[PDB]
Write an enzyme that holds these catalytic residues in place. Structure first.
Site, PDB file in Angstrom:
ATOM      1  N   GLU B 160       0.796  -1.253   0.000  1.00  0.00           N
ATOM      2  CA  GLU B 160       0.000   0.000   0.000  1.00  0.00           C
ATOM      3  C   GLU B 160       0.818   1.287   0.000  1.00  0.00           C
ATOM      4  OE1 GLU B 160      -2.874  -0.321   3.221  1.00  0.00           O
ATOM      5  OE2 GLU B 160      -4.264  -1.298   1.770  1.00  0.00           O
ATOM      6  N   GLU B 240      -6.581  -8.409  -0.707  1.00  0.00           N
ATOM      7  CA  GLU B 240      -6.942  -8.454   0.717  1.00  0.00           C
ATOM      8  C   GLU B 240      -8.426  -8.203   0.877  1.00  0.00           C
ATOM      9  OE1 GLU B 240      -4.627  -6.027   3.293  1.00  0.00           O
ATOM     10  OE2 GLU B 240      -2.664  -6.381   2.310  1.00  0.00           O
TER      11      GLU B 240
HETATM   12  C1  LIG Z   1      -8.079   2.412   6.652  1.00  0.00           C
HETATM   13  C2  LIG Z   1      -6.562   2.320   6.530  1.00  0.00           C
HETATM   14  C3  LIG Z   1      -6.048   0.976   5.990  1.00  0.00           C
HETATM   15  C4  LIG Z   1      -4.643   0.605   6.553  1.00  0.00           C
HETATM   16  N1  LIG Z   1      -4.405  -0.758   6.077  1.00  0.00           N
HETATM   17  C5  LIG Z   1      -4.675  -1.864   6.637  1.00  0.00           C
HETATM   18  S1  LIG Z   1      -5.378  -2.024   8.170  1.00  0.00           S
HETATM   19  C6  LIG Z   1      -5.587  -3.777   7.888  1.00  0.00           C
HETATM   20  C7  LIG Z   1      -4.734  -4.257   6.709  1.00  0.00           C
HETATM   21  C8  LIG Z   1      -3.353  -4.808   7.114  1.00  0.00           C
HETATM   22  O1  LIG Z   1      -2.712  -3.837   7.936  1.00  0.00           O
HETATM   23  C9  LIG Z   1      -2.484  -5.059   5.871  1.00  0.00           C
HETATM   24  O2  LIG Z   1      -1.112  -5.402   6.169  1.00  0.00           O
HETATM   25  C10 LIG Z   1      -2.458  -3.840   4.942  1.00  0.00           C
HETATM   26  O3  LIG Z   1      -1.943  -4.228   3.661  1.00  0.00           O
HETATM   27  C11 LIG Z   1      -3.843  -3.246   4.699  1.00  0.00           C
HETATM   28  N2  LIG Z   1      -4.413  -3.011   6.011  1.00  0.00           N
END
Ligand SMILES: CCCC/N=C1\SC[C@@H]2[C@H](O)[C@H](O)[C@@H](O)CN12
Ligand SMILES: CCCC/N=C1\SC[C@@H]2[C@H](O)[C@H](O)[C@@H](O)CN12
Ligand SMILES: *[C@@H]1O[C@H](CO)[C@@H](O)[C@H](O)[C@H]1NC(C)=O
Ligand SMILES: *[C@@H]1O[C@H](CO)[C@@H](O)[C@H](O)[C@H]1NC(C)=O
Ligand SMILES: *[C@@H]1O[C@H](CO)[C@@H](O)[C@H](O)[C@H]1NC(C)=O
Ligand SMILES: *[C@@H]1O[C@H](CO)[C@@H](O)[C@H](O)[C@H]1NC(C)=O
Ligand SMILES: *[C@@H]1O[C@H](CO)[C@@H](O)[C@H](O)[C@H]1NC(C)=O
Ligand SMILES: *[C@@H]1O[C@H](CO)[C@@H](O)[C@H](O)[C@H]1NC(C)=O
Ligand SMILES: *[C@@H]1O[C@H](CO)[C@@H](O)[C@H](O)[C@H]1NC(C)=O
Ligand SMILES: *[C@@H]1O[C@H](CO)[C@@H](O)[C@H](O)[C@H]1NC(C)=O
Ligand SMILES: [Cl-]
Ligand SMILES: [Cl-]
EC number: 3.2.1.23
Lengths: 603, 605
Positions: B160, B240
Site C-alpha cells: 500500500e 486483501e
Molecule cells: C483504513 C486504513 C487501511 C490501513 N491498512 C490496513 S489495516 C488492515 C490491513 C493490514 O494492515 C495489511 O497489512 C495492509 O496491507 C492493509 N491493512
C-alpha cells in the site's frame, strides 16, 4: 518391614500396623489397550480410589500348554508396577476361574482335550494343569506382594465357587495350599460369593477370608449379616459392588442410575467396609474374548458395563458423583483430571469384496483339511476361537427342500450354510435346529461354524464348540466330513495372501489415510456398519471384535487411536457372515462409517 | 517447462498454459508456531483454497544488521515447502514494509539509528539496508518460485505504498530492479493498494501488476473499476478481502458477520476475480510483535481477527460457510478436515513474587547502564523491544507533591514511576504527561518505560520509543541519567540468574509452577491463560513469551497457550512481569494466581 494383614480386633485391615480400609474399582488390563493403562489408572486415582482390583485371565496368558504371553498388552506384571507407581494398591484375582463375562471364565479351551474333565473340581487332570499355571503365574506375583515392596494387598482364591454345582472343598484346599506355597503365609487370601447363606455354603473355607458381593438392589445390612455369619470378626468387605451390569446380544443395554450407585456407596463406606466397584472402567472384549450365559446368550464386544469410566475411558456424570461420595471419607488428589479422549469422525470408508471364505481356503487352512467320518469339535481340530468350515457332499438329490437338522441342538453356536456356493441360511444354537436346503446329488454342503464365546458361568462351562453332535439330511445322518480349521487372524493380516436373503461369508477390505504432522491425529473413533448384518472387523490386522447391528444393542465398536497410522494407509477388513450391502451397482453402499460418538444402547 | 504468467488477452492467469485463478487465504507464519504450521495449512487446503498468502516481516528475520534468524519458528523456507507439499501455491509478500498490525510494519528498529531516516523512500541509507536484506532473502526465495519447482506464483512489491505520503517512485523502481535482479524476468511482480484513484496514484508502477484491496463494505463494481483503470487487461484481483478486522486495547473486538463475508466472496468469485482472504487464520502476536496506529493506539496480543480459523486454529461457522461458497465454483478436497484442537483447563496456579525489576537490575542489565546528561531513546541504547529503566535523582526536596512532566509528550509509550522504591503512578503517551511525585532530595527516581509497539501505518512509523524528549520536575529539566536496557528475555530463561548460565505496586516478577502427567496420550493440550485481579504486563511459560495481558482494558482477557511449549513430569514455570498492580499483597496466597481455561475470551464487555 511392610505388613498387610487382618486384625480381628477393630474389624479391619492393618497396613503397616495402622487401620486401613480400601476403596477400590475394577479394571481389567486384558480389556484396556496398554497404551491406555496409565490414563485409566490415573483417572481412577483422581476419583479417590486407594486401590484397583483386577482379574488374571489364564487363557489370555497360556493359550497353549507351555506357551505364554506376558508381553505388551499381556504384561500383567507391568500393569501392576504401573498401578504401584501411581500410588495404587492392588486386589489381585488370579482365578484360575474368574467368570467375568470372559471366554470360558478364563479357563483355557485346551483343558477340554480331556472331554470328560470336571472343571473347577479336584479332577486330577484339571488340578495338574492349574498347578502348572500357578507355578508360572504366582512366582511372578510374589515380588509384587505388599510385603515384598509391591502393590498386591489381598488375593482372591477362585471366584464365586459357592455358585457352582460341584461343591468340591478338596479343590479349594488345593488352591489354598498352592497359593500359600508360592506366595508365603502372610498374604491375605480371600473368597467372594453371593451375599446369602446358600452361596456361602460351598464358597467359604477355613483360612480363606470370606467376603461377599452385591449391587444396589440388595439390603446392605442383610448382605453384611450374611458375611458376618461366616466371619464374625475382621473387615466388612463388598468385593463386587455393582456400578452397572452386563449385556447380551439382542437384549436391552443395562444401566444402573448414578443416584442408586452413589446412595448405596455412601452407605457401604459409612459402615467402614472395604469396597470394590465392579466395574470402574469396563473397556472392551476385543477379538473373541467375550463370554456367554446359559441358556446360550453371548455378551457383546463392548464391556462398557455402564461403568463410571465409559468404554473409551470418558469421564461420566456417574464418575463425578462417586468421586463426590468418596470425597466425604478421603481427601482425593489435587490437580485437574486427565480428560476424556478426543474422538474423531473419519466418515465413510468404501470397502471391496476381497474373497469369500470358500474361495480362500488355501490361506485360511495351509495344512489342509482334517477328514472324518462324523463331525469333530473345535477342540478336536485344535482351534479355540473363531470359525471352522465343515464340508460334506449331498448323498441324495434335493430339488425339493430337504430338512438339514441337528437333532441334538449340536450346532455350537451358529452355522452359515451353503450348497454349491448358494447361501441357504443360518442354524442357531437353541433357536433354529432345522433349515430347508436344496441342491444336486454330489453338491458341496458347507457349514461355516462360529464359536460365539464359551459360556463363563453355571454348570455348562465345558463348552466344546463346533458341530458337537451329528447333522441329518431328511432324517439321515450326514457322514464323510472335510473339516477346515481357519487361520482368520493370519490371513487377514496378510490381506488373504493377496499381499504385494443371504450372501456367502466373505472378506471385504478398504482403506483410509490420516494426515501426518497433525498434533491431534490420529484420534480414537467408533466404527459403524450400517447395511451390514453380522461379522468380525480388523483394522491394521487388529481384531476389534464382533459387530451385530442386526440384533443390537451395540451398534458401534471402539477403535483406539494407537492402532491407526499416518505414514501409510490404514486397512479395514470385515468378515460379513450373513448379508453384505455390496451387490448393488452403487459401490457407495458397500461401506463402513467412523463416527465420533458410541451407540451401545440401541433399541 | 513450468510457467506462471498473466494472460493479458484473456484477462487471466496461465499456469502451464492453462487458465488459472486463485482463491487464497492469508496466514502469517510469524503468528503461528511451527508446531501448528501443517495443521493450519491443511485446514486451509480443506477449505477449497488453492493458494496461501503470507508476509515476510523483515524485523522477524534480521533483529540486528547481518544477524539472521531463519530456523524453527523463523524458518520461512520450510513454511513454503510445507505449503507446496500440501499442493498449495503461494503468494509471497516480502515488503520490505508489510504494515500487517506488526511492530513498525516489519521494518527493523535499527534503521532508526539514523534519526533523520526517511523510511519507504529513496533515502540512500534506507535503500542500502533494504538492498542488503533483499540480497539475503530473495536468493532463498528463488528456488521456491513456481518456475523453479516451488509454490511461489506471484510476489508483492512494497505494501500500500499509495497510502504513504512520500510518493517516491524512484524507490519503487529500485525495488522492482532488485526483485528482478534476484528473482529473474518471469516472476509476476504486483502491488496492492486501496480501491480508489487517490491510493493508486502513488502505489501503481509500470511493470508491476496493479491490484486492489477491499472488504465487505465496499462496492465490488466500483472497486474492480478502479483496478481496471490502472490495468485495463489481465485478471481482477482483490489481494486483501477482509474477512474481519483488527483490534486495539480498550476498544470492542471487531467482528464481521459470516453472511456478509460469504455473499461478498460469492460476488467476487462470480466476476472471475482472483481473491485472497485476509486473514484466513490470524494467530497471535507473541512477545512484542504487535504494531500500533496513530493517534497512538496499540493492537493487542491476539490476532484472531475474527478470521475463518480462530486464533488457536478452530474451524468456525465462518470457515464452513466460506468453504460452502467455494464449493459452488471449485471442487474442494475430499475427506475429513483436521479438527479444532482439544483445549484443557489446567485450573488455578498460584504464583509468588520473586523479585522487583528494581532488585533484578544486575541480572537484567549485566554489562551495566549508559550514562547521559539528557534521556536517550530505546534505539540509542541499543534496545528495540520490551522495557528500558531510566534512573535519576531528585534535584530538590519534594516533600510536597511536585509535578513530573514530559512537556513535549515524549514518554513512548508508558512509564511506570517510582521514587525510592515507592510507586507513584504512570505516565502515558498522549493521555497523561504529568504525574505528581513525592520524595526526599536525592531520592532515586525510576521510570520503567515500555515500548507498546511501533506504529505500523501512517507517516509516523519512525517511532523511536523511550523518553524521546526531556522530563521536567517543577518545570526544570531533569539531568544526569543512568539508563539500563533490560535483557528481560534472557533473565526470564535463567529464572533471574536462579538457574545459572549453562493504587500501584512496584513492577515485579511473579513465578509459579504446575505439572502435567506423562504417559497420557492427550496431555498436554492447548489452553488459555487468564489473569483475574492482575492489571497489565508480560507473561512467559517455560521462557516462551506469550505476549502482553491487559485485562484492565480488554477486549482480550485470555492469551493463547500452544501445547508444545508445555512439558510433562518437569514443572512448567509461569513467569508474570506485572507492571501496575499485582493481587499479591493480602495474607491470601490463593489471590496471587493465574487460571487456565478451555475457552478464549477476546470479545467481552
Ligand atoms: C483504513 C486504513 C487501511 C490501513 N491498512 C490496513 S489495516 C488492515 C490491513 C493490514 O494492515 C495489511 O497489512 C495492509 O496491507 C492493509 N491493512
Ligand atoms: C446371579 C448372577 C451371578 C453371575 N455373576 C456375575 S454376573 C457379573 C459378575 C461377573 O461375572 C463377576 O466376574 C462375578 O464374580 C460376579 N458376576
Ligand atoms: C434392611 O433390612 C433390615 C433388617 O435386617 C431392616 O431393618 C432395614 O429396614 C432394611 N433397610 C432397607 C434399606 O430396606
Ligand atoms: C421344509 O419344507 C417343508 C415342506 O415344503 C415345510 O413343511 C417345512 O416348513 C420346511 N422347513 C422349515 C424351515 O420348516
Ligand atoms: C453321529 O452318529 C454316529 C452314528 O450313530 C455316532 O457314532 C456318533 O457318535 C454321532 N456323533 C455325534 C456328534 O452325535
Ligand atoms: C485404499 O487402498 C486401495 C488399494 O490398496 C487403493 O486403490 C485406494 O486408492 C486406497 N484409498 C481409497 C480406497 O480411497
Ligand atoms: C455499485 O456501484 C455501481 C456503479 O458503478 C452501481 O451500479 C451499483 O448499483 C452499486 N451496487 C451496490 C450494491 O451499491
Ligand atoms: C498535581 O498537584 C497539583 C497541586 O500542587 C494539582 O493542582 C494538580 O492537579 C496535580 N496534577 C496531577 C496530574 O495530579
Ligand atoms: C533536552 O533539553 C536540552 C536543553 O533545552 C536540549 O538541548 C536537548 O535537545 C533536549 N533533549 C531531548 C532529548 O529532548
Ligand atoms: C519452580 O520450578 C523451578 C524449576 O524446577 C525451580 O527452580 C523452583 O525452585 C520451583 N518452585 C516451586 C515452588 O515449586
Ligand atoms: Cl475385578
Ligand atoms: Cl498476507
Amino acid at each position: 518391614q511392610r505388613m498387610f494383614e487382618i486384625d480381628y480386633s477393630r474389624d479391619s485391615f492393618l497396613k503397616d500396623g495402622q487401620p486401613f480400609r480400601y476403596i477400590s474399582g475394577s479394571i481389567h488390563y486384558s480389556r484396556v489397550p496398554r497404551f491406555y493403562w496409565k490414563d485409566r489408572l490415573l483417572k481412577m486415582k483422581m476419583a479417590g480410589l486407594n486401590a484397583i482390583q483386577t482379574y488374571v485371565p489364564w487363557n489370555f496368558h497360556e493359550p497353549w500348554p507351555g506357551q505364554y504371553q506376558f508381553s505388551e498388552d499381556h504384561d500383567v506384571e507391568y500393569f501392576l508396577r504401573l498401578a504401584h507407581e501411581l500410588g495404587l494398591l492392588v486386589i489381585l484375582r488370579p482365578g484360575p476361574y474368574i467368570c467375568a463375562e470372559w471366554e470360558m471364565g478364563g479357563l483355557p479351551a485346551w483343558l477340554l482335550e480331556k472331554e470328560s474333565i470336571l472343571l473347577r473340581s479336584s479332577d486330577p487332570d484339571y488340578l495338574a494343569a492349574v498347578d502348572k499355571w500357578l507355578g508360572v503365574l504366582l512366582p511372578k506375583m510374589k515380588p509384587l506382594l505388599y510385603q515384598n515392596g509391591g502393590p498386591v494387598i489381598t488375593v482372591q482364591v477362585e471366584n464365586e465357587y459357592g455358585s457352582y454345582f460341584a461343591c468340591d472343598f478338596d479343590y479349594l484346599r488345593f488352591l489354598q495350599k498352592r497359593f500359600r506355597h508360592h506366595l508365603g503365609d502372610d498374604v491375605v487370601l480371600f473368597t467372594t460369593d453371593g451375599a446369602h447363606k446358600t452361596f456361602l455354603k460351598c464358597g467359604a473355607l477355613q483360612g480363606l477370608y470370606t467376603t461377599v458381593d452385591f449391587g444396589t438392589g440388595s439390603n446392605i445390612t442383610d448382605a453384611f449379616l450374611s458375611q458376618r455369619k461366616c466371619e464374625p470378626k475382621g473387615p466388612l468387605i463388598n468385593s463386587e459392588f455393582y456400578t452397572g451390569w452386563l449385556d447380551h446380544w439382542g437384549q436391552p443395554h443395562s444401566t444402573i442410575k448414578t443416584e442408586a450407585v452413589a446412595s448405596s456407596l455412601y452407605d457401604i463406606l459409612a459402615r467402614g467396609a472395604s469396597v470394590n466397584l465392579y466395574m470402574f472402567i469396563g473397556g472392551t472384549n476385543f477379538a473373541y474374548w467375550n463370554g456367554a450365559n446359559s441358556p446360550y446368550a453371548a455378551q457383546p464386544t463392548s464391556y462398557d458395563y455402564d461403568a463410571p469410566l465409559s468404554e473409551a475411558g470418558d469421564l461420566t456424570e456417574k464418575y463425578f458423583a462417586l468421586r463426590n461420595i468418596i470425597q466425604k471419607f478421603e481427601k482425593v488428589p489435587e490437580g485437574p483430571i486427565p480428560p476424556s479422549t478426543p474422538k474423531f469422525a473419519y466418515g465413510k470408508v468404501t470397502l471391496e469384496k476381497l474373497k469369500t471364505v470358500g474361495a480362500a481356503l488355501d490361506i485360511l487352512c495351509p495344512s489342509g483339511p482334517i477328514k472324518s467320518l462324523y463331525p469333530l469339535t473345535f477342540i478336536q481340530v485344535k482351534q479355540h476361537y473363531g470359525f471352522v468350515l465343515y464340508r460334506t457332499t449331498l448323498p441324495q438329490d434335493c430339488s425339493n427342500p430337504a430338512p438339514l437338522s441337528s437333532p441334538l441342538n449340536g450346532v455350537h453356536d451358529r452355522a452359515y450354510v451353503a450348497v454349491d456356493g448358494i447361501p441357504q441360511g443360518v442354524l442357531e444354537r437353541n433357536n433354529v435346529i432345522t433349515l430347508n436346503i436344496t441342491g444336486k446329488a454330489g453338491a458341496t454342503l458347507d457349514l461355516l461354524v462360529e464359536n460365539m464365546g464359551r459360556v463363563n458361568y453355571g454348570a455348562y462351562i465345558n463348552d466344546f464348540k463346533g458341530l458337537v453332535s451329528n447333522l441329518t439330511l431328511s432324517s439321515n445322518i450326514l457322514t464323510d466330513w472335510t473339516i477346515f480349521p481357519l487361520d482368520t487372524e493370519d490371513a487377514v493380516r496378510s490381506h488373504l495372501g493377496g499381499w504385494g436373503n443371504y450372501t456367502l461369508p466373505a472378506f471385504y477390505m478398504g482403506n483410509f489415510s490420516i494426515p501426518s504432522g497433525i498434533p491431534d491425529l490420529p484420534q480414537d473413533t467408533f466404527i459403524q456398519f450400517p447395511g451390514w448384518t453380522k461379522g468380525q472387523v480388523w483394522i491394521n490386522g487388529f481384531n476389534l471384535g464382533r459387530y451385530w447391528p442386526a440384533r443390537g444393542p451395540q451398534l458401534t465398536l471402539f477403535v483406539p487411536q494407537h492402532i491407526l497410522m499416518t505414514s501409510a494407509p490404514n486397512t479395514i477388513t470385515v468378515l460379513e457372515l450373513e448379508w453384505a450391502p455390496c451387490s448393488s451397482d452403487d459401490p457407495e453402499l458397500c461401506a463402513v462409517t467412523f463416527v465420533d460418538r458410541p451407540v451401545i444402547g440401541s433399541s
